[PDB]
Amino acid sequence: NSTNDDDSIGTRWAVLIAGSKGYHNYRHQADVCHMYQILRKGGVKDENIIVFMYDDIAYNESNPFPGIIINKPGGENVYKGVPKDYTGEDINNVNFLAAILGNKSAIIGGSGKVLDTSPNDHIFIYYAXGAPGKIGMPSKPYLYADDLVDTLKQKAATGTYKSMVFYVEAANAGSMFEGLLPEGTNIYAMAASNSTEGSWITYCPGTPDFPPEFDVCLGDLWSITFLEDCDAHNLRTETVHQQFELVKKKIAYASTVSQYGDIPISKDSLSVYMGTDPANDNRTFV
Ligand SMILES: *[C@@H]1O[C@H](CO)[C@@H](O[C@@H]2O[C@H](CO)[C@@H](O[C@H]3O[C@H](CO[C@H]4O[C@H](CO)[C@@H](O)[C@H](O)[C@@H]4O)[C@@H](O)[C@H](O[C@H]4O[C@H](CO)[C@@H](O)[C@H](O)[C@@H]4O)[C@@H]3O)[C@H](O)[C@H]2NC(C)=O)[C@H](O)[C@H]1NC(C)=O
Ligand SMILES: *[C@@H]1O[C@H](CO)[C@@H](O[C@@H]2O[C@H](CO)[C@@H](O[C@H]3O[C@H](CO)[C@@H](O)[C@H](O)[C@@H]3O)[C@H](O)[C@H]2NC(C)=O)[C@H](O)[C@H]1NC(C)=O
Ligand SMILES: *[C@@H]1O[C@H](CO)[C@@H](O[C@@H]2O[C@H](CO)[C@@H](O[C@H]3O[C@H](CO)[C@@H](O)[C@H](O)[C@@H]3O)[C@H](O)[C@H]2NC(C)=O)[C@H](O)[C@H]1NC(C)=O
Ligand SMILES: *[C@@H]1O[C@H](CO)[C@@H](O[C@@H]2O[C@H](CO)[C@@H](O[C@H]3O[C@H](CO)[C@@H](O)[C@H](O)[C@@H]3O)[C@H](O)[C@H]2NC(C)=O)[C@H](O)[C@H]1NC(C)=O
Ligand SMILES: *[C@@H]1O[C@H](CO)[C@@H](O[C@@H]2O[C@H](CO)[C@@H](O)[C@H](O)[C@H]2NC(C)=O)[C@H](O)[C@H]1NC(C)=O
- Domain locations in the chain? 12-280
Residue 277 φ then ψ, to 5°: -75, 120
Distance 105 CA to ligand 3 centre (A): 9
For a mutational test of ligand 2's pocket, the pick from 24, 56, 84, i.e. the residue with the most ligand atoms closer than 8 A to its C-beta, is: 56
User: Which among 115, 118, 120, 199 is positioned nearest to 152, based on CA atoms?
Assistant: 115
DSSP code at position 205 = B
Query: For ligand 4, which residues put their CB under 6 angstroms from it?
Result: 194-197, 256
Residue 86 near residue 51, CB atoms below 8 Å: yes
Which run of H or of E encompasses 143?
strand 143-144
**What is the C-alpha to C-alpha distance for residues 244 and 233, in angstroms, rounded to an integer?**
15
For residues 238 and 103, what is the distance between their CA atoms, to the nearest angstrom?
Answer: 33
Burial 140-154 (b: 16+ CB within 10 A, else e): eebbebeebbebbee
Phi, psi of 104 (to 5 degrees): -70, -25
CB distance 19 to 176 below 8 Å: no
- Residue 263: helix, strand or coil by DSSP? helix
CB 169 within 8 A of CB 31: yes
Q: Are 199 and 28 in contact (CB under 8 A)?
A: no
Ligand 2, pocket residues at CB < 6 Å = 22-23, 56, 59-61
Angle, in degrees to the nearest 10, between helices 221-232 and 240-250: 130
User: Cα–Cα distance between 101 and 35 in angstroms, integer?
Assistant: 21
12-280: CATH topology: Rossmann fold (3.40.50)
Cis peptide before 141 (omega within 30 of 0): yes
- Residue 1 alpha carbon to ligand 1 centre in Å: 13
User: Among positive and negative, which fits the CA dihedral 158, 164, 170, 173?
Assistant: positive
Q: Would you put residue 40 in left (φ > 0), alpha (ψ -120 to 50) or beta?
A: alpha
Cα torsion 209, 254, 262, 150: sign: negative
Q: Which secondary structure element, helix H or strand E, spans residue 126, and what is its range?
A: strand 122-128
CA 138 to chain centre: 16
Resolution (A): 1.9
Q: Cα(35) to centroid of ligand 1, in Å? A: 47
Q: How was this structure determined?
A: X-ray
Q: Which of 95, 97, 105 to mutate to test the pocket of ligand 3 (most atoms within 8 A of CB)?
A: 105
